[PDB]
A paper describes a structure:
On the other hand, glycogen degradation requires the glycogen debranching enzyme (GDE; GlgX), which directly catalyzes the hydrolysis of α-(1→6)-linked glucose residues and the glycogen phosphorylase (GP; GlgP) to generate glucose-1-phosphate, which feeds into primary metabolism. In this study, we identify the GDE of S. venezuelae, GlgX, as a target of c-di-GMP thus uncovering a direct link between c-di-GMP and glycogen metabolism in this bacterium.
To visualize the effects of c-di-GMP binding on GlgX substrate binding and catalysis we crystallized the GlgX-c-di-GMP complex in the presence of substrate analog, acarbose (Methods section). Acarbose is a pseudo-tetrasaccharide that is a well-known amylase inhibitor. Interestingly, however while the pH 4.6 structure revealed density for all 4 rings of the acarbose docked in the active site, the pH 8.5 structure captured an intermediate in catalysis whereby the reducing end of the molecule had been cleaved resulting in the loss of one sugar and density at −1 of the reducing end of the molecule (using nomenclature from Davies et al.). Comparison of the GlgX active site conformation in the GlgX-c-di-GMP structure to the acarbose bound structures reveals that they are essentially identical. Key contacts to the −1 substrate sugar are provided by GlgX residues Trp222, Tyr224, His271, Asp342, Glu378, W380, His449 as well as Asp342.
Numbering used by the authors:
A (entry chain C): 1 to 549, 553 to 586, 593 to 705
B (entry chain H): 1 to 549, 553 to 587, 593 to 659, 662 to 706
Write the structure that this text describes.
Amino acid sequence: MQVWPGQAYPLGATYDGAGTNFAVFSEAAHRIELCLLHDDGSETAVELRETDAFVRHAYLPGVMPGQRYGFRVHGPYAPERGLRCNAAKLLLDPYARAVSGRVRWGEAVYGYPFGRPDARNDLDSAPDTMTSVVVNPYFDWGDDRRPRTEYHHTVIYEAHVKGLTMLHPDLPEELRGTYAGLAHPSVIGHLRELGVTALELMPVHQFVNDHRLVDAGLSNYWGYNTIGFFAPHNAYASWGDRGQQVLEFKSAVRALHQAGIEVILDVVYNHTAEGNHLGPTLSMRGLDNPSYYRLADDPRYYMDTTGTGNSLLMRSPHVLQLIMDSLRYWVTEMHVDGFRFDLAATLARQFHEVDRLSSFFDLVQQDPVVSQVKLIAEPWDVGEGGYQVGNFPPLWTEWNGKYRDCVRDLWRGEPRTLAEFASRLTGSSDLYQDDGRRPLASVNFVTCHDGFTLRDLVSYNEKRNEANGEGNRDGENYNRSWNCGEEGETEDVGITELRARQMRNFLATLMLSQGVPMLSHGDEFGRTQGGNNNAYCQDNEVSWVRWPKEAEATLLRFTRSMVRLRREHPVFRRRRFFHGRPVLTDIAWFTPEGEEMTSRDWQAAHAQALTVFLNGNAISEPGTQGERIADDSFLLMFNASAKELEFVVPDSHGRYWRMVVDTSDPEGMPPQQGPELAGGERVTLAPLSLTVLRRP
Amino acid sequence: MQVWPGQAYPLGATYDGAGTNFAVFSEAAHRIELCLLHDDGSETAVELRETDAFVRHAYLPGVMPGQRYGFRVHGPYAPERGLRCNAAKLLLDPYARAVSGRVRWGEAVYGYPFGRPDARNDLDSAPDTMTSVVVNPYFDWGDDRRPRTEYHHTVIYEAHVKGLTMLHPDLPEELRGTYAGLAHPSVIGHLRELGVTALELMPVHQFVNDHRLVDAGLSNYWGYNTIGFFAPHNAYASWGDRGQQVLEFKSAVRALHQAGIEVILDVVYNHTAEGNHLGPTLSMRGLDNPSYYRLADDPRYYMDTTGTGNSLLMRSPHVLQLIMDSLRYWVTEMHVDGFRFDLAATLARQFHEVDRLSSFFDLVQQDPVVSQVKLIAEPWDVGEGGYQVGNFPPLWTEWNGKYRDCVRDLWRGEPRTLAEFASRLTGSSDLYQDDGRRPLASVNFVTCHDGFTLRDLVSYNEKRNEANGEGNRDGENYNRSWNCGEEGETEDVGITELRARQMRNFLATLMLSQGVPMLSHGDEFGRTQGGNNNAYCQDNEVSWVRWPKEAEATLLRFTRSMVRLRREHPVFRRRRFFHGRPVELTDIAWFTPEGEEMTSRDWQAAHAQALTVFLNGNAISEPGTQGERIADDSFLLMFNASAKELEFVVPHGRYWRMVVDTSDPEGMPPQQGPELAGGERVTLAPLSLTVLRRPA
Ligand SMILES: Nc1nc2c(ncn2[C@@H]2O[C@@H]3COP(=O)(O)O[C@H]4[C@@H](O)[C@H](n5cnc6c(=O)[nH]c(N)nc65)O[C@@H]4COP(=O)(O)O[C@H]3[C@H]2O)c(=O)[nH]1
Ligand SMILES: Nc1nc2c(ncn2[C@@H]2O[C@@H]3COP(=O)(O)O[C@H]4[C@@H](O)[C@H](n5cnc6c(=O)[nH]c(N)nc65)O[C@@H]4COP(=O)(O)O[C@H]3[C@H]2O)c(=O)[nH]1
């Protein structure tokens, strides 16, 4: 038999050489039973009797990795009390390091009769449920140098595990769309060729194909609907789901870490794949409903702060413990370099309000494992006071959703005051400066997985989510986009070259900006999604990354060479805001004709032209060793006008500035040199074009 | 000036091989300078310029360990807002891994002019102040097996580092009263001889003798008045103060851990040694006052839920981080095994009420370093809603204040504490069963550092603290004690035996009571504080532990034999609660002195001071380390707190053996006894105990 009492910590199934020590949390269970599934669907149940601080535990020697296991909570069923415990269902371990199988959708996985939401389901769950697996924690990272690339050298590349590699004509068939293929040399090379220093992996926690999707012809692609917070996703693993998916991810990191490539993965802690009531009872519903999920004034129904069914209680210690244990386990055992938190406002909702003194923030700021890895937050959620951009604690880094909306409104041509675009270029002073932050707190991005891609952003006015199954009712409605004259694809040479160069504008404005640049995957080649902007369920050629074999490889070498500029020239990645008001003047703003803009020229309604001077000799920032940082002085000239404009170079005839970037050109100016301008001489600059000059 | 920007983590002086990095937090400091002290007192200031998330820092190559340093925080001095920043006072390092020197009490360590509280003082504090020192973290714990003694084997021995060894006629005079003398073989041999598994260490966090106390002829001895949250008290060091005292501690833990004795130390996190205003500016008054201390509804004045000057803000993320970074520093760097939190209800006061969902409770519960060590609490503060015995989370253990009073009462004679004393032997079923805890969650104790020692407990009716300088106003006013005929020293052998046998009565009940016991240092030799019940300032023979050279060595072998009787028989240290009756095995049954099971009427019969308890050694419904069953001889405990003799009956056919008797003056847990029939009547003296041991 061999049922030893074991230990209470750590939570989950841990392989201590000769056996495995199990420990799960439930304060609302009279009895808890542990099931040991075999390869034929037989359950060898064991009662974890030894409770300690509402966590029941036991050590069962002989149990080893590959053991399919799960729990069955004997507890009250009373939605009136908030409890939905059911022994009939096979509950997943929240602390499971690897989950096997898919959810086979049926009336059994749900925990309530399909006609009576307050009755109780007595159907066995195991033959249709996912199944948590014990994992051997061993891995020999030889020299896993965490390439601790600082914020002022970081190029974040948002990408998917599957879409990035799925259609790659260099990975053998098996590896396309897996973690293993993500480690391939032709992808790491591409990533190292493109200049990225951080890789953002769209949700990699094990997530569930939604029932509403499976019974609609679709699947869950993005993966922002998760149940296994410690489990690499089994469907992204070509090495098996019997606890061998973690072996890929670890090896996927080590291969990536060898090339000086960081891994910052996208975490979704705000909600769970169990949805609201009327959803499935899979992992945490049956264990402890009241202290895992945020229930409403009527405990039957669920408080939502994400619009997606449920939301976790951020003040119950066993929920905070699960997230800190989740983060760290991905830091120190998966060697993940950082996290992009999803809708991170919900994580700071202690009772109702968004608190920046909330216990979650208190925890993260102090723990020596998480507080040092790159902490990125999506600074909003769909509750009251949901817009919190510029209110997270000064440790954090935020998605500048105001950079997206301000830049997409500049190149679109709207009367977005230049003084609204000029602080987004300076790196969002108005949002972060008083908070005690630096420009690197702003993660700038012209496009991400949400909204249009880059090609869709310069080709479509309104969304095209008909094929999502919701009558075009999902995604952002107006995306500050402009089709460039005709919506959809078109053979018009004028519309084509305009779109191909509007894209150039977006990537050029992004790199010359201050803070952290971010690229959505595919925009290097011009990835299209056919007007679809919220492709959470488009798991097909719509969201795959097509790979190039001329125009798509004109924009490619353009973008790479634009990254070289930001890298090579530290003026574009400064550690602290310019001031330059009274004395060296580290920034200056002149009009096209060549005079310093005035308070009246600045925010006058219809003005769409700028010249920006960036003083490379006024970087009062020490390097790593107190080394004073130098760089050539640059002259960025923006023309958001519909017309051809005449820009004067405002220094003197004394000196010479060489043009190094010019959006207008069809061959690509960031990868191709050009003429050097006199210094008082007039330079005609095409409509919706950009230009940069360089001088030491 | 080789000054590199350095890192912002961790806070404090860390030695990176080539040099040392300093990082300090202040969110209301415009300019922070790093003063580096020399041996002729001259300073060498350098700006910690690099402000990152309100943590200013720098790294200085070549700066070796032993360097005396400190921060001077230029900022606002305005007590109407709560700011007492003073760039004249040499602020300590809240993360000082060793603090040298002592406070020379003068008008210069005080930050304000003595006659005017809210004015400004520009007196240099440098020489009159302690100094935070850089420490080299190396120490070779070759094979330092943390003796992770279980919870149901612990015997806590609360000791002070100085009194334990200042008067031991075996250490060299160098080592009397220091950390090294605490780990001499003659001491660890005694703790081994006594059977303890834990050494509760009265505060070693480096503290300051109060100005209040030093202009009186006295000196703070206990040390519950702390500034150094990372340093060992330099006045306990025989090896030096320039960072060398940290070695004393690390090597004093190495020795105790080799002989298998754990380290539990007394932490004081609720309050600081700067007290309220009118007091010094040493570490946190001048660093960032409003974010460190819990301020009033008038920022000039300090909230005080402790009565010791001030209280700490348990909601500012950077005070909880200072606690945690301290907590994890004594386990991960100095190999401590647990902490006793003092006034631990103040730690949970997040705003006003004692919140068991306070961030602090959610921080300890989660952290892998601190949730695993022994978490012992003193569950009360003097503030409103202070007494919270039985209300801490289930992860926590408490000093059972309702045990101490109710056993002090019983042997004192009060006609109430029988049904109450019963549960206190049961393990305080009232206070802990429903909370989800075990009998072990209650630290039982009759006497501690507070109140009377055990000899004073039976030799005084009221306090005698005139020597403390507050005219007998401090401490407990009634401590639930009895003088046994005469208060003070007598020679009547009738009283003296009653005292020496009363001392046997508590220790007997303490080692036979369910849960975790605690021994105050010196109650083996019958230590006497001369009636001083609150001796926090008596750093003299009053609290010095007197080592014995006839009666003193009789009670000694009494206690040691009782702590064994706990060890060798697990019933007195059970791991679950009793249930008494299989409604449809009987593991406990209470009998009358007459010899019949009691009745709910006869239980709460007011006039009753006699008892017979049965314990079933064969009905321990608990597993063992390897699923085994626990087996034991069954015991029969006979309490007579009556003023006279009462004939006690054994419940007929079998035999029983008498193992414990308080009455006979040779001491009879080390002295073998007769065999009692099983129906026979037995005479039990007034205020005495008896235990029977037929094997089951
Ligand atoms: N010695 C010293 N000089 C100080 C200090 N604070 C400001 N200065 C000087 O005064 C300017 C104003 O700084 P700010 O208004 O806080 O506005 C600051 C702040 O927004 C940001 N910044 C610069 N360095 C840091 C830093 O290390 N950490 C953070 N968090 N922000 C920084 O850049 C702004 C100004 O950059 P600068 O070109 O440095 O211009 C700074 C610098 O000239 C200080 O505490 N000590
Ligand atoms: N920390 C901790 N404390 C424990 C544990 N088990 C018992 N205790 C405490 O000790 C009491 C004695 O339990 P019992 O003698 O087994 O008498 C128990 C036992 O026979 C049964 N029982 C209670 N819980 C369980 C359980 O989870 N499994 C099984 N099989 N029986 C249980 O019902 C009785 C009443 O249980 P309680 O009301 O809780 O009464 C329990 C509870 O107060 C434990 O695993 N951990």
